[PDB]
């Protein structure tokens, strides 16, 4: 990788997400989304470096912050479709052609950390909240298919989730130090998928009825000592990291476990392995994957990155490449790679956005 360009926002707030449209069509250039300050800005990739200029969603509360987005797809037209959230617990769903706000949808309207479509089903979308809870939503039938909390769910904010290969479970993460799955493949959850397609309020009486989930499948606060600020399945595998220096992976129970039939009450862990590296101990840091899954990419609080190769025999065998540009000194929040892996970017603190070349 090379740094080929960069550029800043006239906010000068921190960019808090950054994410390429992996569903962009055969022959149109890689397009990419930053969300920060109250906006939401798509950039196309170009040769020589060009970072071109699109077109910025900006909400109409100046005191709005949008701390995540995630793309996905009308499923019925094809046509691509970006949705973000922050601080005011609004998702938006925003058409990426012409910025227009689609449509909205609210909670309880607490603080939205992290936004994630189901891997397979390009309507189901996964927030999660400074509430404590995960909340599932259908965005064909805009109903709430499903609350994740309770006692026994997470007991501060909820900072990142990832659904696993095929979206049949969760793994959550938060301040509460502690990572937490949830099955979403049960007898009980694929008939709330089911009924939530069947759900139009044009045609009946009954208002929607949302799950609440109150039990994970698995807890442990056993991985990290401090805030769990982002998790990414890697197989059966877990991947995440805290403020330690850290990323750790990690599998719930005994070494030969199978993910499937762990129990809720299982006490076990296992670490497979853990990348570290410098300079990122402070709160609210990302790491990012590629579509393919063979390589892994963070940011630290000084402008510098980390890529991991994962295409080796087990997990802790990785290897490490970094990255450094002298005029890259702000903390880089989030990056995205795109599909091909060809481009990564990196985006900063100062409002900055970094991309590197391969
Ligand atoms: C808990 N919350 C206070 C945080 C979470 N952060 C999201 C976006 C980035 C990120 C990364 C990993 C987990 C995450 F949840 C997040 C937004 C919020 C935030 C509000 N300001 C004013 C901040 C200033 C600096 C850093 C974070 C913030």
């Given at each position: 990788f ?5 550029l800043?926002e ?8 950054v994410?390429?449209?992996w569903?962009?069509?055969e022959g ?8 920060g300050?109250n906006?939401?800005?798509?950039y196309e990739?170009?040769?020589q470096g ?7 969603y900006?909400?109409?509360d100046a ?6 987005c995630?793309?996905?797809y009308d499923?019925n037209?094809?046509?691509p479709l970006l949705?973000?959230?922050?601080s ?6 925003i058409?990426?052609?012409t910025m227009?706000?689609i449509?909205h949808?609210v ?5 939205i ?8 089903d390009?309507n189901?979308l996964?927030s999660?909240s400074?509430?404590?809870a995960?909340?599932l939503w259908?965005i064909?039938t ?8 309770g006692?026994e ?5 909820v900072?990142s ?6 979206g ?9 130090h502690?990572?937490?799955?949830w099955?979403?493949?049960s007898?009980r959850?694929?008939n ?6 069947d759900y139009?309020?044009n045609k009946?009486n009954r208002?929607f009825?949302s799950?609440?989930?109150?039990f994970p499948?698995?807890?442990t606060?056993d991985?990290?000592?401090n805030y769990?600020?982002?998790?990414r ?6 991947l995440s990291?805290?403020?330690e220096?850290?990323?750790?992976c990690?599998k719930?129970?005994?070494?030969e476990?199978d993910?499937?039939?762990?129990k809720?009450?299982?006490?076990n862990?296992?670490?497979?392995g853990?990348?570290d590296y410098?300079?990122?101990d402070?709160?609210?840091?990302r790491?990012?994957?590629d579509?393919?899954?063979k390589?892994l990419?963070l940011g ?8 991991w190769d994962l ?5 802790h ?8 540009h ?6 880089i929040?989030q990056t995205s790679?795109?599909?091909?892996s060809?481009?990564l970017?990196?985006v ?9 070349d391969?």
């Amino acid at each position: 990788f090379k740094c080929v360009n960069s550029l800043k926002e006239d906010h000068n707030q921190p960019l808090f997400g950054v994410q390429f449209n992996w569903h962009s069509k055969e022959g149109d250039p890689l397009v990419f989304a930053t969300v920060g300050s109250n906006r939401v800005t798509l950039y196309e990739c170009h040769s020589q470096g060009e970072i071109r200029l699109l077109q910025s969603y900006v909400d109409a509360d100046a005191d709005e912050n949008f701390y995540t987005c995630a793309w996905t797809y009308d499923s019925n037209t094809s046509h691509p479709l970006l949705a973000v959230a922050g601080s005011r617990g609004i998702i938006r769903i925003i058409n990426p052609i012409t910025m227009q706000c689609i449509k909205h949808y609210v909670g309880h309207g607490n603080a939205i950390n992290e936004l994630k479509f189901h891997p397979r089903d390009p309507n189901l979308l996964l927030s999660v909240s400074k509430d404590h809870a995960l909340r599932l939503w259908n965005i064909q039938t805009d109903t709430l298919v499903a609350i994740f909390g309770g006692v026994e769910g997470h007991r501060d904010e909820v900072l990142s989730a990832d659904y696993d290969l095929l979206g049949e479970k969760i793994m959550s993460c938060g301040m509460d130090h502690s990572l937490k799955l949830w099955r979403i493949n049960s007898k009980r959850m694929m008939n709330a998928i089911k009924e939530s397609y069947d759900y139009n309020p044009n045609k009946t009486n009954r208002p929607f009825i949302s799950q609440k989930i109150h039990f994970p499948d698995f807890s442990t606060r056993d991985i990290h000592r401090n805030y769990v600020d982002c998790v990414r399945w890697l197989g059966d595998l877990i991947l995440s990291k805290s403020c330690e220096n850290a990323i750790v992976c990690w599998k719930p129970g005994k070494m030969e476990d199978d993910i499937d039939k762990i129990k809720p009450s299982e006490s076990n862990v296992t670490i497979l392995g853990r990348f570290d590296y410098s300079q990122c101990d402070i709160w609210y840091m990302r790491f990012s994957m590629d579509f393919w899954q063979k390589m892994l990419a963070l940011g630290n609080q000084v402008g510098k990155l980390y890529v991991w190769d994962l295409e080796v025999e087990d997990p802790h065998k990785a290897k490490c490449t970094t990255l450094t540009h002298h005029k890259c000194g702000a903390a880089i929040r989030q990056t995205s790679f795109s599909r091909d892996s060809s481009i990564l970017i990196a985006v900063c603190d100062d409002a900055s956005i970094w991309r590197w070349d391969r």
